[PDB]
């Protein structure tokens, strides 16, 4: 039921007395096609093991997101370290207008319709984190009604 | 259940000095006496009662309780308390990642159990002396570390702690896993990670004992229920 996308894999080095020890980092993200989403960032000497780790970690530390039907509930900004992200709810049919790692996380999240730009850095890791942050902070109409002591129709 | 007079007698109301406090504890502080913080018993009591009730409820559903104190003044007492209600405890140094990294520690438990078996049930004696001394030493080490939690099986369903600042590693583990935390929190301590805080003197022995005894009684009650 869960869908999982390996966003990126990158070779990283550690210099030692002999020479360079190489290793691999795997950035993955998983989601159930609904509110729930989680990213994982694994590391191992070989690629498949590292992606396996990324999947494991993602499967843990999952986070829920309040989706109005296929899209978002309102425009939302999210940042992390360099990657600053804007994403905006959009009409059915438009699809996921987003670039790169961001796209991936959106798809697994089960959002189908967004207009979305990544300002600043586009370092996959940071940008996916920023996306997750923007999705988490985003609140729903019912939530704001509750926050504020009102009915949904009062807020419209 | 536990009265205010008794707590006063114990020395709960006493709290750390005025240069060592935490401003998140400002609500729980009443005043400062001889440049020493006083804990507000009026606000402490009801919450302590609450915490007791929650612990009882946990017990009723057959919850596993872990008693943590590594202050080495009240290690004996926390062990005694754990045993009275036949629950589990960590009276010596908490192993970093005992709960988060359970699966590894579970092997540790198993090795300890095997060693215990060898010692007692086998009755095999006839072991090379140095080797026998080494095995004995290993047994002692593992008993000290994991004696209380050996029969635990899996992960506790609640975590009682005697000091938050001292056992912050355990607290953090519980939070990461989501285990309910029941902490005694002096003025210097940080109660943010704690779910059911308890403002009381972690240091004084009699106060610690009192805390323990009430907790044990309510666990026993929940078991009876």
């Amino acid at each position: 039921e869960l869908q999982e996308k390996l966003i990126a894999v990158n070779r990283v080095s550690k210099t030692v007395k002999g020479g360079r020890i190489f290793s691999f980092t795997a950035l993955t993200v998983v989601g159930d096609g609904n509110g729930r989403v989680g990213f994982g960032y694994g590391k191992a000497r070989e690629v498949p093991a590292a992606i396996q780790k990324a999947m494991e970690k993602a499967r843990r530390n999952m986070i829920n997101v309040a989706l109005n039907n296929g899209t978002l509930q309102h425009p939302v900004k999210g940042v992390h370290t360099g990657s600053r992200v804007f994403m905006q709810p959009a009409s059915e049919g438009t699809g996921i207008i987003a670039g790169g790692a961001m796209r991936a996380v959106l798809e697994v999240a089960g959002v189908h319709n967004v207009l979305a730009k990544a300002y600043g850095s586009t370092n996959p890791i940071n940008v996916v984190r920023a996306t997750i942050d923007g999705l988490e902070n985003m609140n729903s109409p019912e939530m704001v009604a509750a926050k504020r002591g009102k009915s949904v129709e009062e807020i419209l | 259940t536990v009265s205010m007079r008794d707590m006063l007698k114990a020395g709960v109301h006493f709290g750390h000095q005025t240069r060592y406090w935490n401003p998140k504890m400002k609500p729980f502080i009443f005043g400062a006496r001889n440049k020493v913080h006083i804990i507000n018993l009026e606000k402490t009591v009801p919450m302590f009662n609450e915490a007791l009730a929650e612990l009882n409820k946990i017990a009723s559903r057959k919850g596993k309780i872990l008693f943590v104190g590594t202050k080495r003044a009240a290690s004996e007492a926390v062990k005694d308390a754990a045993l009275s209600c036949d629950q589990f405890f960590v009276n010596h140094r908490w192993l970093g990642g005992m709960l988060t990294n359970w699966k590894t520690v579970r092997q540790s438990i198993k090795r300890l159990k095997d060693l215990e078996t060898q010692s007692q049930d086998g009755t095999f004696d006839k072991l090379t002396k140095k080797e026998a001394l080494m095995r004995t030493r290993e047994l002692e080490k593992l008993e000290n570390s994991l004696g209380g939690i050996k029969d635990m099986g899996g992960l506790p369903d609640a975590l009682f702690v005697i000091d938050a600042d001292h056992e912050h590693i355990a607290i953090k583990e519980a939070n990461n896993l989501g285990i309910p935390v029941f902490a005694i929190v002096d003025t210097n301590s940080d109660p943010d990670g704690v779910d059911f805080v308890i403002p009381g003197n972690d240091d004084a022995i009699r106060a610690v004992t009192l805390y323990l005894g009430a907790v044990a009684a309510t666990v026993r009650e929940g078991r009876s229920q």
């Binding site: - | 020395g11 006493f14 009443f30 006496r33 001889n34 020493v36 009026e42 003197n201 004084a204």
Partner: protein, 259 residues
């Protein structure tokens, strides 16, 4: 309610700062630490050497009560300054009692003049005296049976520096530190001074009205350099020391202990 506020001020009313109210019940003994609880934030790590009387064995079991001392709080965890100092207040009260009738009567046995004046000891403690006070007249207890028993009749006290000289015999007979710092001066006046803190080059014995002495590291013993003062004497103990040197200007009285 105000129950608690009234209690807080009540409990203020029923304790004081110094070691005055004998309140701490000895709730655990083990060698070499006694512990009490005088209604303080924590229990005191008491030495055994505050509580053995005059021949080297303990005297108080569980439940027993002595007050300790205060006005210093939490070096990182704990509570007190020790209780024998409390006993010093009782000794001071006994000494003051003399004033009422102009005669304090105890036993006082003064064999030899440490710093000019015979040393007189009251039950547990031993205090040092100025010369005249040991004897009412030139009688000179050196010809008396050693460590003889008479009493103490006060000849001289310094009234800020605990130097008290008393008259053993003859029952019938009946700023501030630094301007005139020439009393313990001349070359070699020995003193009874409690050490305060050993700074790994020193010991800091300093008793005589707000001064500072250093018996630092060189004498202390009859070994020079491998000594490490903490091993060789004590913490908080009244000892043999004498001046050997005074600055009145740069306030460095450099005592010694090899004597």
């Amino acid at each position: 309610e105000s129950f608690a506020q009234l209690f807080e001020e009540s409990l203020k009313e029923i304790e004081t700062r110094p070691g005055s109210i004998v309140r701490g019940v000895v709730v655990a003994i083990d060698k070499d630490v006694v512990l009490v609880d005088a209604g303080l934030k924590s229990e005191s790590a008491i030495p055994a050497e505050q509580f053995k009387n005059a021949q080297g064995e303990l005297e108080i079991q569980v439940g027993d009560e002595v007050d300790v001392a205060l006005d210093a709080v939490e070096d990182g965890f704990g509570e007190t300054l020790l209780s024998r100092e409390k006993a010093k207040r009782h000794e001071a009260w006994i000494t003051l009692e003399k004033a009422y009738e102009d005669a304090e009567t105890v036993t006082g046995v003064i064999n030899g003049k440490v710093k000019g004046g015979f040393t007189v000891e009251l039950n547990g403690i031993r205090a040092f005296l100025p010369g005249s006070l040991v004897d009412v007249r030139p009688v000179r207890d050196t010809l008396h049976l050693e460590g003889k028993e008479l009493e103490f009749k006060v000849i001289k006290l310094d009234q800020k520096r605990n130097n008290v000289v008393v008259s053993r015999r003859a029952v019938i007979e009946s700023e501030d530190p630094w301007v005139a710092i020439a009393k313990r001066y001349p070359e070699g006046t020995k003193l009874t001074g409690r050490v305060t803190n050993l700074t790994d080059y020193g010991c800091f014995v300093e008793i005589e009205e707000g001064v500072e002495g250093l018996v630092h590291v060189s004498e202390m013993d009859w070994t020079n350099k491998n000594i490490h003062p903490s091993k060789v004497v004590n913490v908080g103990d009244v000892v043999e020391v004498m001046v050997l040197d005074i600055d009145e200007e740069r306030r460095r009285i450099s005592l010694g202990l090899k004597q």
